[PDB]
Every structure is written in structure tokens, then in C-alpha cells.
Write a protein that binds this ligand. Structure first.
Ligand SMILES: [Mg+2]
Length: 124
């Protein structure tokens, strides 16, 4: 049921929307505002699923994902946390690109509740 979610999203407005949805379904959300902070969070705590904005200041979702996969591999007991890409843009082989970038699923913004919750359940 209840999941620990890392949300990386640079836009404050979008952070609040996503948190409202996720908390409505009893999830526990850690919110960060860039890719560097997401990498730092993954080193400190195990999450059930990561929601990762593609375009972010300081460090984007593709770069952060690469670092996360490398770190989680380097562990004595390796782990792999699923990552869902969040993108405003959509529909032209984006999902494959995301999957090539080592992400698991994609969601277009603005986030749709049904899709968000079902994709988390698919992943976690
Ligand atoms: Mg962004």
C-alpha cells in the first residue's frame, strides 16, 4: 500500500500538485528541486519509486538517473529503484528514449491522477 516516493521537480507549483495527489493516496513524499538533490537523497534513503522531472536546473533527470543507477549498482547488496520520467512534452518515441536513459516509465505533465497512481503501482 503506502510508498516512500522521491519527487524531483523544479517548479514549486508542480511540486505542490504532485504532493497533493500522492498524499491523498497515503504516500510519503520527499520533495527535491533538482537532480543533484535527488542523487543525494538516494544515497541517504531507500525509496519505493522516484518521480523525476526531465528538465531541471543544476542537473536534469537523465543525468540524475545515470548517477542513481551507477550508485545503486555500486552497493554491496545492489538495488534498483524504479524511476518514472515526468515530461511536459510527449508522444514521439519519448518513452523509448526514457527507457534507453535507464528510466522505467514516463508521465506527461500536467500530471493525471489515475495515470500517476496506476504507474506507481505498476512500478513499486
Ligand atoms: Mg522542470
Amino acid at each position: 500500500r503506502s510508498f516512500e516516493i522521491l519527487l524531483a521537480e523544479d517548479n514549486a507549483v508542480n511540486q505542490r500538485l504532485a504532493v497533493k495527489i500522492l498524499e491523498k493516496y497515503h504516500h510519503v513524499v520527499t520533495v527535491v528541486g533538482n537532480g543533484e538533490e535527488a542523487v543525494e537523497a538516494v544515497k541517504r534513503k531507500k525509496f519505493d519509486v522516484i518521480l523525476m522531472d526531465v528538465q531541471m536546473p543544476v542537473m536534469g533527470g537523465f543525468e540524475a538517473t545515470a548517477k542513481i543507477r551507477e550508485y545503486e549498482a555500486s552497493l554491496p547488496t545492489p538495488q534498483r529503484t524504479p524511476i518514472i520520467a515526468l515530461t511536459a512534452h510527449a508522444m514521439m518515441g519519448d518513452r523509448e528514449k526514457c527507457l534507453e536513459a535507464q528510466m522505467d516509465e514516463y508521465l506527461s505533465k500536467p500530471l493525471q491522477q489515475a495515470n500517476l497512481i496506476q504507474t506507481i503501482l505498476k512500478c513499486a
